[PDB]
Design a protein around this ligand. Structure first.
Ligand SMILES: *[C@@H]1O[C@H](CO)[C@@H](O)[C@H](O)[C@H]1NC(C)=O
Lengths: 97, 49, 216, 184, 28, 128, 82
């Protein structure tokens, strides 16, 4: 368990933030396995831009996205994939949500 | 300069003050004070209220 | 290493316009630090124009004002010149000289292109007439290659077997607009009666192939 | 990695971010400035302040940050922290109550030729004269003056990247329509 | 742990956290 | 070799920004002050706060940073970060929000003859 | 200016800010606390909060930060980051 600032991190940020804050709320620590695998689970408080469909307000539904990408590295340097461990969803823990 | 929508700056003199230079006061102090004299444009309150 | 590559050589006629490019690789160049310098045949270097950070706009010599346009494109690392209303006197080798970081009110030109030859001529493609320069203890003989356009011509002696003492002069442009040169060789006077001497003249634009035997 | 580690160590052994990154002090640093408008957050009529979310793309050459790719395994481009290098000090002159200069120091893309690309984000709070005569049918011309605060044109030259701002990634606004945009 | 400290010293000797991990050029 | 770097090493290799630029402790440092106002943002009556956008013109002499253009290739000006030179530490005393200092620490301009110029911009929230 | 530079270099050669600045660890540091009230900004009756602008004047003696003014060109006082 190593402080995140001590290792290389991918500069993955919320691109569609609304308040100008791109980064995570707390850097915390990464978990490094003996094979070089690095797992990082930082907390984040995010304010993302969401275009409101106002037509049926208040009987409305919204489609609010959180766009995450590397700010600097191109696709030829850092490649992204959806996290899983075929579960392409936001994880909501039912007990503690 | 774009004037404030509600406030017009009429005067703005500056003065260099010196004080606490007496023996009892001890080491002297100084500062610069600018006095922004600003006039409100009351049009909103006249029309609306 | 930084390289400047200019466009190819151009054959033009009077009154037309020529545009020469100058593309850079191995380095990063900007909107300034571009200067064009022509060298007319058998003459010295001459500054034509350029762009300096001080004027933030091209400046030209009085000789070229109204006829010359100089531009530089930072995004594609290339610069151009465009000289219009071409004259016979505009025949020259045109160079681009550049600096990656421009001087404010002067220029240095650390990086030069290979140069482009622009020939403004109303003549047409024409082959040479080859005449002997007959030998009158060393004797001299040669071949007069006259009235051809365009350059170049290649001259060899005895199918390349005779190279010692051979001097092929640079071509001279005549007032008619056609070129002329002479190729000469010094040989022992005793060998004039025993040895054959033939100059092999080639002009590719006309497909002229002449083997002229030179004898007294 | 090892090649890039060696390259970074070589580059920043005797580097100085104080002086301008020129071979000769009589040379000018040319900075290509390109503003990308991502979002029009708010138009404040009362305080005369337009808030926008922008990317301020800056491009310039650093003479001392050059290398031969053949000497480092063919590495032709790297990403380095922007805080370590000299940068131009672009400031929003008409800043109303936001930040005057860039505060989000994202990474620069550095080429082996010394070319730098730095594209930090910013929240521009600009002071624009709001004419409310035709409200809500009003049209507003709002500007953003940018320049090097402490460098003059004789040591640092700035040129627009394009004649217009980049609106390719602009999010649609539910309150305003941008009729025209242009950079002079 | 002393062993953990030794392992950390071994790992971070010559390690640059600003350099992306790529053993060969072109590795993603 | 860039002449700016040679000048910077000459001036700052042996230099203390913590000490005032005075040959004797009893000497005084004279600061030439100009305050330029760009925008009056608002006067909040409820909080009794005036918000302004200004930039302060600050000029003074530093004999330690004295140089001649002739000895350094004609350089008449040098930009360095303000954290490397002594500053008089000018603050707005009557601020209401606890923000005493300037908004952006701009470079100081070190002219020949020991003349130092600092022109930082600031956002101030003052008591009114 | 050079006298102050030499003095500051001498004072902080082997200085420690974590330990109380006393000659003996059994000695007590005496701190004189004086509160200057500048402005009463607001009284919040709902949340029961009083917000004020103050200057908290603090005066103590650091045993290790002493010098002879004769040895440093007559410098009797300096300004140090807190
Ligand atoms: C700086 O030094 C020069 C001599 O090199 C002197 O002529 C000049 O007056 C000095 N400037 C100051 C500190 O006033």
């Amino acid at each position: 368990r190593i402080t995140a600032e001590s290792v290389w991190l991918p500069d993955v940020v919320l691109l569609n933030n609304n308040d100008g804050n791109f980064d995570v709320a707390l850097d915390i620590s990464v978990v490094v396995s003996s094979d070089g695998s690095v797992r990082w689970q930082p907390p984040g408080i995010y304010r993302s831009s969401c275009s409101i469909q106002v037509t049926y307000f208040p009987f409305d539904w919204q489609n609010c996205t959180m766009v995450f990408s590397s700010y600097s590295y191109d696709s030829s340097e850092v490649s992204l994939q959806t996290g899983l461990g075929g579960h392409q969803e936001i994880h909501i823990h039912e007990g503690t949500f | 300069y774009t004037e404030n929508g509600e406030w017009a700056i009429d005067f703005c003199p500056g003065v260099i003050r010196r004080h606490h230079g007496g023996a009892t006061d001890g080491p002297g102090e100084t500062d610069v004070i600018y006095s922004l004299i600003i006039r409100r444009k009351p049009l909103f309150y006249v029309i609306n209220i | 290493q930084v390289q400047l590559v200019q466009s190819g050589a151009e054959m033009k006629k009077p009154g037309s316009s020529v545009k020469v490019s100058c593309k850079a690789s191995g380095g990063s160049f900007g909107s300034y630090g571009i200067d064009w310098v022509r060298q007319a045949p058998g003459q010295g270097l001459e500054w034509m124009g350029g762009i300096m950070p001080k004027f933030d706009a091209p400046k030209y010599a009085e000789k070229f004002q109204g006829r010359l346009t100089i531009t530089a494109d930072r995004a594609t690392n290339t610069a151009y010149m465009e000289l219009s209303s071409l004259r016979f006197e505009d025949t020259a080798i045109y160079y681009c000289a550049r600096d990656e970081q421009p001087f404010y009110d002067s220029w240095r030109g650390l990086y030069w292109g290979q140069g482009t030859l622009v020939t403004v001529s109303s003549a047409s493609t024409k082959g040479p007439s080859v005449f002997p320069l007959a030998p009158s203890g060393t004797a001299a003989l040669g071949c007069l290659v006259k009235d051809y356009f365009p350059e170049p011509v290649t001259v060899s002696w005895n199918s390349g077997a005779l190279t010692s003492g051979v001097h092929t002069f640079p071509a001279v442009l005549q007032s008619s607009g056609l070129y002329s040169l002479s190729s000469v060789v010094t040989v022992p006077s005793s060998s004039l009666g025993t040895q054959t001497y033939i100059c092999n003249v080639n002009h590719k634009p006309s497909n002229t192939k002449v083997d002229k035997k030179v004898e007294p | 990695s090892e090649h890039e580690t060696r390259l970074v160590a070589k580059l920043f052994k005797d580097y100085s971010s104080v002086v301008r990154p020129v071979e000769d002090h009589r040379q000018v640093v040319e900075v290509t400035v390109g503003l990308q408008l991502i979002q029009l957050i708010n138009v404040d009529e009362v305080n005369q302040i337009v808030t926008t979310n922008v990317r301020l793309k800056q491009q310039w050459v650093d003479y001392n940050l050059k290398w031969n790719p053949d000497d480092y395994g063919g590495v032709k481009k790297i990403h380095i922290p922007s805080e370590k290098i000299w940068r131009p000090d672009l400031v929003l002159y008409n800043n109303a109550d936001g930040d005057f200069a860039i505060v989000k120091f994202t990474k620069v893309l550095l080429q082996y030729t010394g070319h730098i690309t730095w594209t930090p984000p910013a929240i521009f709070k600009s002071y624009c004269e709001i004419i409310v005569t035709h409200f809500p049918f009003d049209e507003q011309n709002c500007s953003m003056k940018l320049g090097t605060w402490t460098y003059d044109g004789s040591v640092v030259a700035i040129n627009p990247e394009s004649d217009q701002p980049d609106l390719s990634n602009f999010m649609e606004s539910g309150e305003w329509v941008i009729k025209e945009s242009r950079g002079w | 742990s002393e062993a953990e400290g030794r392992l950390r010293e071994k790992l971070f000797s010559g390690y640059d956290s600003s350099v992306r991990p790529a053993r060969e050029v072109g590795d993603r | 070799k860039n002449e700016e770097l040679r000048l910077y090493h000459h001036l700052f290799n042996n230099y203390d920004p913590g000490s005032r630029p005075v040959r004797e402790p009893e000497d005084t440092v004279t600061i030439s002050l100009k305050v330029t106002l760009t925008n009056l943002i608002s006067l909040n009556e409820k909080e009794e706060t005036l918000t302004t956008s200004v930039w302060i013109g600050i000029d003074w002499q530093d004999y330690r940073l004295n140089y001649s253009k002739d000895d350094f290739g004609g350089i008449e000006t040098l930009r360095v970060p303000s954290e490397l030179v002594w500053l008089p530490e000018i603050v707005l005393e009557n601020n209401i929000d606890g923000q005493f200092g300037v908004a952006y620490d701009a470079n100081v301009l070190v002219y020949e003859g020991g003349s130092v110029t600092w022109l930082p911009p600031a956002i101030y929230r003052s008591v009114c």
